Design an enzyme around this catalytic site. Structure first.
Site, PDB file in Angstrom:
ATOM      1  CE1 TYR B  27      -2.949  -3.484   1.247  1.00 17.03           C
ATOM      2  CE2 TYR B  27      -3.984  -1.335  -0.375  1.00 17.03           C
ATOM      3  CZ  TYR B  27      -4.123  -2.851   0.033  1.00 17.03           C
ATOM      4  OH  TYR B  27      -4.870  -3.815   0.247  1.00 17.03           O
ATOM      5  N   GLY B  29       3.039   4.107  -1.286  1.00 13.45           N
ATOM      6  CA  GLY B  29       3.406   4.948  -2.098  1.00 13.45           C
ATOM      7  C   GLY B  29       2.315   4.178  -3.950  1.00 13.45           C
ATOM      8  N   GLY B  31      -0.720   1.881  -3.408  1.00 12.29           N
ATOM      9  CA  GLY B  31      -1.365   0.838  -2.875  1.00 12.29           C
ATOM     10  C   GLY B  31      -2.799   0.385  -4.200  1.00 12.29           C
ATOM     11  CG  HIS B  47      -2.234   8.507   3.461  1.00  9.82           C
ATOM     12  ND1 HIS B  47      -1.430   8.423   2.209  1.00  9.82           N
ATOM     13  CD2 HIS B  47      -1.448   9.855   3.590  1.00  9.82           C
ATOM     14  CE1 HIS B  47      -0.488   9.578   2.578  1.00  9.82           C
ATOM     15  NE2 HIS B  47      -1.622  10.476   3.128  1.00  9.82           N
ATOM     16  CG  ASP B  48      -3.188   3.983  -0.119  1.00 12.88           C
ATOM     17  OD1 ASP B  48      -2.344   5.232  -0.220  1.00 12.88           O
ATOM     18  OD2 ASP B  48      -2.966   2.971  -0.086  1.00 12.88           O
ATOM     19  CE1 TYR B  51      -3.432  12.232   0.966  1.00 19.22           C
ATOM     20  CE2 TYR B  51      -2.818  11.520  -0.590  1.00 19.22           C
ATOM     21  CZ  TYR B  51      -2.343  12.017   0.325  1.00 19.22           C
ATOM     22  OH  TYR B  51      -0.677  12.561   0.631  1.00 19.22           O
ATOM     23  CE1 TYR B  64       0.401  19.349   4.655  1.00 19.04           C
ATOM     24  CE2 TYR B  64      -0.168  17.863   3.005  1.00 19.04           C
ATOM     25  CZ  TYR B  64       0.260  18.461   3.743  1.00 19.04           C
ATOM     26  OH  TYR B  64       1.689  17.283   3.969  1.00 19.04           O
ATOM     27  CG  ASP B  89      -0.484  13.900   3.739  1.00 15.83           C
ATOM     28  OD1 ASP B  89      -0.838  13.552   3.653  1.00 15.83           O
ATOM     29  OD2 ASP B  89       0.384  14.930   3.326  1.00 15.83           O
TER      30      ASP B  89
END
Lengths: 4, 121
Positions: B27, B29, B31, B47-48, B51, B64, B89
């Site tokens: 997952y 980089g 995923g 994290h995936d 997003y 950001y 993040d």
């Protein structure tokens, strides 16, 4: 160039 | 943005996002499928998903702002998308820090065929  | 996330990762962990977290497990980089290999890979899975919660945001490119309050990451107010991307993040960077104790170099450049099956967010 494109990471985490 | 991806570059900002990478700087956050380096700040947090002392590892360069490329190559330490850009091709790790199933997952990190790139995923999509598989059972996450370990706790670090589960950080990437979540994290995936995080997003994935933001289909009308552009987390690779949208920048950001954040600051540090004695170690702590504090996301500063931008657009709604920027705020939500920052929180995703931040969580991943903290998660990577929390799981450095089990990070394994054997999962760098992990081959795709060993990652099979959908896992729901």
């Amino acid at each position: 160039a494109i990471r985490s | 943005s991806l570059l900002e996330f990478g700087k956050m990762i380096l700040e947090e962990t002392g590892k360069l996002a490329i190559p330490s977290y850009s091709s790790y497990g199933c997952y990190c980089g790139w995923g999509g499928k598989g059972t996450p290999k370990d706790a670090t890979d589960r950080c990437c899975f979540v994290h995936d998903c995080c997003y994935g919660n933001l289909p009308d945001c552009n987390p690779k490119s949208d920048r950001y702002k954040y600051k540090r309050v004695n170690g702590a990451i504090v996301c500063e107010k931008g657009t709604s998308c920027e705020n939500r991307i920052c929180e995703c993040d931040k969580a991943a960077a903290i998660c990577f820090r929390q799981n450095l104790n089990t990070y394994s170099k054997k999962y760098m450049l992990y081959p795709d065929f060993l990652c099979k099956g959908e896992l729901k967010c």
